[PDB]
Structure 1
Amino acid sequence: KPHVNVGTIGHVDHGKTTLTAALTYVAAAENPNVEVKDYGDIDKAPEERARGITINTAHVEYETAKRHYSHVDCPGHADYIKNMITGAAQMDGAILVVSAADGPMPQTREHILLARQVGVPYIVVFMNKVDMVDDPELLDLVEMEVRDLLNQYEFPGDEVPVIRGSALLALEQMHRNPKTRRGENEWVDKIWELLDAIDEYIPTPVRDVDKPFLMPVEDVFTITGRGTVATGRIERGKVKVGDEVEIVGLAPETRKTVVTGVEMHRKTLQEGIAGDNVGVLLRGVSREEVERGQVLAKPGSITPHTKFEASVYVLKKEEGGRHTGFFSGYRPQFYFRTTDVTGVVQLPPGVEMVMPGDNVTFTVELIKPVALEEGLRFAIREGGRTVGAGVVTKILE
């Protein structure tokens, strides 16, 4: 059975974690290899249990007749957007959870836009909490609103599956009868509609290995005796022990080193490929030479830059942005892969300001170099709000 990565996204409290638990229980009735997980086993940290909130992304495994799934359950709270982005970057498809009782909310919109920015190719929708809605008209409206949102963000909104169900009632049924099978219960069958939907709508992924190697540095560790280890998810290409690599960005100059080891969890590998979360041991360099925000790459394949042009969508308040636009001189934070760097905006000649809801173009000068290339997507934040989502269109300096 091929392996596929999926996950749950959506506004705070709409039901992501409860749905994740339900998925493990429902799938386990048809497969003895699946380990069932209760709500408290997913939101397992003391703080998560205390306030009933997802803080850390959780990784759970389950399977269908067709595939083995690794599911990343993401937090919906704005305070943990970094963890949500980190989780979305691992997904081959995402399950957008939308409460039928509340309808789309700011992070319903923001999560779809950000999922697109990180490269999630497909979204399946689970309209949750329908057990709380007795009005069929409202359900139709919520579905229309969600399909409209998906269309607005360039996903095939009229094609995507929109499953109407109750994660809670399905989970309660599985607790009462862990062997409930297909066809026996309406709520459990809605979970099967979702499992069948991810099986048929999320394409079997093809790792992006036919490209020069690049891995954003997530974190850096010094293993006593072994050396400096840079962790990250390989974005493209492959890396083998003995390969020469460049550390690009942030520092005054690019630095070269050699890969002396590749590991994944407690496994020693001789090579890592696109899609792998790995620890890369680097020759000679210390933590003073490799840090979060830099990238490791095939030498000569990407260079550091500070000035670029970009196409940017300016977010509205209801999408996580602001009601007001901005002018030349604006100094927000720019996020490229694992980099966070301040930059200064310069609007094109004749453009006084750019407004929320518009797709505009402008120039940016960063305060430190970043590994940049045409086609690189990014986000702009200011004051804890996502003000723009963009893509680099031209390298100037």
Structure 2
Amino acid sequence: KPHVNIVFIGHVDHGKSTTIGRLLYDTGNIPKFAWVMDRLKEEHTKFETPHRYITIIDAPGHRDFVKNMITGASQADAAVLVVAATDGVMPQTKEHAFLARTLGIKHIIVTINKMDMVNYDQKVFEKVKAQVEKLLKTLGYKDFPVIPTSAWNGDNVVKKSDKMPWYNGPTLIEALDQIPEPEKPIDKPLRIPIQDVYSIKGVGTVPVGRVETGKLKVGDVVIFEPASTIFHKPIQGEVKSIEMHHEPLQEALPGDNIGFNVRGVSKNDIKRGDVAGHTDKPPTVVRTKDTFKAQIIVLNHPTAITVGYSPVLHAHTAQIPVRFEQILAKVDPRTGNIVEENPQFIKTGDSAIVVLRPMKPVVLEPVKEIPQLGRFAIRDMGMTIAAGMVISIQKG
């Protein structure tokens, strides 16, 4: 049985806790329902399905929810978006779906909860379903289940409802049982951030780095960025050999720290913070004429962060000066929800959505595409100011 991590999102009071509660209650996984729900409120929990081991890895409402999601300390394979049939899709529903998209969560399960409060009505479910479909289509999601539920009464969480014969789809627990296995780093495009560059006599130019994603084989042609962008010509060549622990390899996989000899590349053309990829799928370069959106959590700062702040960005093996161009939103670190648009400043403990401009070219990837190159730290004044994740890149 494959292990799978899930997170429950959705607007406050739409029924995330109750749904989790009901799941645990009906599968006999508790560590009257009303009593029990009280006890749970006061105090990771796993449960087992026929085909899956399921961990609820994190949840909106605790101190480090946004931090854990941003740093990748908490990582979900699927998100269950809870939407109340009474309220429908609210702004905070849209925000949370955007967050799931940003994190590269590919599988979404929607529950339309509190069906009992709208008399289990089909017309109501369909109206809300249509709102849910419009939002998730906007974000690129397709073929996700939309499940009418009453977390309080039990309908369609674990047991099939006798109150909604018009619904033919799966229950929540049946939808969780069908969460596809996580995509593997080996199947993402090759990326090798360069740690150091050596010249070995009789051999030539030998970069050293850890394969983060994809697979490097002897004979592959690799291209280096931002070296290629900086020098206005492709810095690339054939991989003649691979070594680890002073022994030959024919291929290198995610996690392998390797030396690789590249034909036709000069030692001076590549350095620390360059990244190797296939010419087919070259590492993305954010130039100084470009910008990028990021979600950050402010870990420490002596005063407050404002537009124009210019610290150092650290990602993979690179470091560059970066400028804060805009702060688009202040984000509650507990919920992941927006509490202010266009705030003037950000302080320790705040999360924010920011537009950053690299002051030197840098390889960055949106976390939704390649997370190993989409997470970064901000450093300044001898400390770690912020942890961040790349949302998107805007070319100039």
> Scaled by the length of structure 2, what TM-score is found?
0.50
> Scaled by the length of structure 1, what TM-score is found?
0.50
